[PDB]
Nucleic acid binder design. Structure first.
Ligand SMILES: Nc1nc2c(ncn2[C@H]2C[C@H](O)[C@@H](COP(=O)(O)O)O2)c(=O)[nH]1
Ligand SMILES: [Ca+2]
Length: 581
DNA sequence: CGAGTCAGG
DNA sequence: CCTGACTCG
């Protein structure tokens, strides 16, 4: 470990402000909202510089350089720095290259989380892993200034050298536009969404928490009665001892550890003993309480009564976003009790409203586009109820002969075909035999032979090329596609069929977000994006903007790309997220 | 901190 | 098929 030379600067000079630089604005805290910036590094043609943040960020020339978009910066995780700067009232502009997002497009499977891991991709090893410098556990700490300053300078030096080879490879992959015109501009939009946050009505939440605690308390006693003794209901082991050993309930399923107590199992067991539907009710209410009442309350900021999620833009293997702390992509919607949680998410100004627009069946629509199946494309061109139609074709019955159970099964087929669900997968979800499931699937392929062609083709393409691709050229490598293990190979085959479907739907909505943000600005609307939930966008805006958004938002989303079938977008607005339905 | 469970797509 | 949070041992 020899030293990399740099100026440990005590003040900002003009040569620190060239119009191209690798920049590091280092935020050590995992969650970067309102977090400290611990140090700054700049590398450019004139040399290598460490600046303390109290100096650099009080310097009006450095600040102006930060916000000048003609001063081009290369970074890693620009969103982290952008947001932590927004919290100090400082704008970051002119980020022309984000190494994190470059690594993520070249290979999402690398799990690139720091500069050093991106650097390894190009055999560059003169930089340490953040974990090696900072530590990990309760032991994660900012080191002393010489250790820190060298680490930041090494990171910036790595960014300066790696930009060339990352761009060369993106270019060869035809992903250069995906980075420059899609992921990098999206990064700025997510930063605004995160910084803006979502207002929470903590009273509504605390009241719901009271009612839940009362019910949960009733159901808790009833379970202790029905078992003739008290035990930890949240312990799957202890519960498994009450059900299958004290009460003698049949064992239909085992886990790898012991007895399964998963919902699926428990519904099957419901007829034999009363305590079963109480354990089910308890699980339901206990999830709402500990995760959605207690969990949400703990992360709202008492300064603003907002939650500020972080959208992970470089995590998922398909090009989706994810969301953390809080996860605002899994707020309950399916059952009414949980859905009421959404009444707690409110507009951030008085006389503003929540507006939600969602693609209708985007994944099936994309499948129809990519497979070019005549029947499926016709169904969408007719805007048919797609599950009813699938039931008609697979059971060869007419429309008003479709029973609700038949529609439910065609629906489970439509849900699974977008990832090439196997006969076993479908049998499981439908509670039927694998041979019956195989038949449904065989009937599906007779009605949608283009889907079948697609599934065979995409698997051959994954084998020959080594990867699959989405509409805007995102990639996923699938080395398991040739494995001699059947289970392993089967998974890779489902990933081959799913990834272009799911990833292309991620592409489209990401584009919609970019187009929407440009149109909102052109229109000078005060409306702004709050959330993305995979196929849905949630905004808040003045009440006076609602009629305009009813037209503009679906429009932008529908026209984001042009497929062989229309994209269809529904939209709703109201006083609270719950009411925007 | 792996496993299980369950919330969403 | 793609996720994240909570709890337990
Ligand atoms: N790995 C791990 N095992 C635990 C813990 N507590 C109880 N057991 C068994 C814990 O914190 N970690
Ligand atoms: Ca407990």
């Amino acid at each position: 470990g020899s030293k990399m030379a740099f100026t440990l600067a005590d003040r900002v000079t003009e040569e620190m402000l060239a119009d191209k630089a690798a920049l590091v604005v280092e935020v050590v805290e995992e969650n970067y909202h309102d977090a400290p910036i611990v140090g700054i590094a700049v590398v450019n043609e004139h040399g290598r510089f460490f600046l303390r943040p109290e100096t650099a960020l009080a310097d009006p020339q450095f600040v102006a350089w930060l916000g000048d978009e003609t001063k081009k910066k290369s970074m890693f995780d620009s969103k982290r720095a952008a947001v932590a700067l927004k919290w100090k009232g400082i704008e970051l502009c002119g980020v022309s290259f984000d190494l994190l997002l470059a690594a993520y497009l070249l290979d999402p499977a690398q799990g690139v989380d720091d500069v050093a891991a991106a650097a390894k991709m190009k055999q560059y090893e003169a930089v340490r892993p953040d974990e090696a410098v900072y530590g990990k556990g309760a032991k994660r700490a900012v080191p002393d200034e010489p250790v820190l300053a060298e680490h930041l300078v090494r990171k910036a030096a790595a960014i300066w050298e790696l930009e060339r080879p990352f761009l060369d490879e993106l270019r060869r992959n035809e992903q250069d536009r995906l980075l420059v015109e899609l992921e990098q501009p999206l990064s700025s939009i997510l930063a605004e969404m995160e910084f803006a946050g979502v207002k929470v009505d903590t009273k509504r939440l605390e009241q719901m928490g009271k009612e839940l605690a009362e019910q949960l308390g009733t159901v808790e006693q009833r379970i202790y009665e029905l078992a003739g003794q008290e035990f930890n209901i949240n312990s799957p082991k202890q519960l498994g001892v009450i059900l299958f050993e004290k009460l003698q309930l049949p064992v239909l399923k085992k886990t790898k550890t012991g007895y399964s107590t998963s919902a699926d199992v428990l519904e099957k067991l419901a007829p034999y003993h009363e305590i079963v539907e109480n354990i089910l009710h308890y699980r339901q209410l206990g999830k709402l309480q500990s995760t959605y009442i207690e969990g949400l309350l703990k992360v709202v900021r008492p300064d603003t009564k907002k939650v500020h999620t972080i959208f992970n833009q470089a995590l998922t293997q398909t090009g989706r976003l994810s969301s953390t702390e809080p996860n605002l992509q899994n707020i309950p919607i399916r059952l009414e009790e949980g859905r009421k949680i959404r009444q707690a998410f409110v507009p951030s100004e008085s006389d503003w409203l929540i507006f939600a627009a969602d693609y209708s069946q985007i994944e099936l629509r994309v499948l129809a586009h990519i497979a070019e199946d005549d029947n499926l494309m016709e169904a969408f061109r007719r805007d048919l109820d797609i599950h009813t139609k699938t039931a008609m074709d697979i059971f060869q019955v007419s429309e008003d002969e479709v029973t609700p159970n038949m529609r439910r099964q065609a629906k489970a087929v439509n849900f699974g075909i977008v990832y090439g669900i196997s006969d076993y997968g479908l049998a499981q979800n439908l509670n039927i035999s694998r041979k019956e499931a195989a038949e449904f699937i065989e009937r599906y392929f007779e009605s949608f032979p283009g889907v079948k062609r697609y599934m065979e083709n995409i698997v051959q393409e994954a084998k020959q090329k080594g990867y699959v691709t989405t509409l805007l050229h995102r990639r996923r490598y699938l080395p398991d596609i040739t494995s001699r293990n059947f289970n392993v190979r089967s998974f890779a085959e489902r990933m081959a069929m799913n990834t272009p479907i799911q990833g292309s739907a991620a592409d489209i909505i990401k584009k919609a977000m970019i187009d929407l943000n440009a149109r909102l600005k052109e229109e000078r609307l005060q409306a702004h994006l709050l959330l993305q939930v995979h196929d849905e966008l949630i905004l808040e805006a003045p009440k006076e903007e609602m009629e305009r958004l009813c037209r503009l938002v679906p429009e932008v989303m529908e026209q984001a790309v042009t497929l062989r079938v229309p994209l269809k977008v529904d939209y709703h607005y109201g006083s609270t997220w719950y009411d925007a339905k």
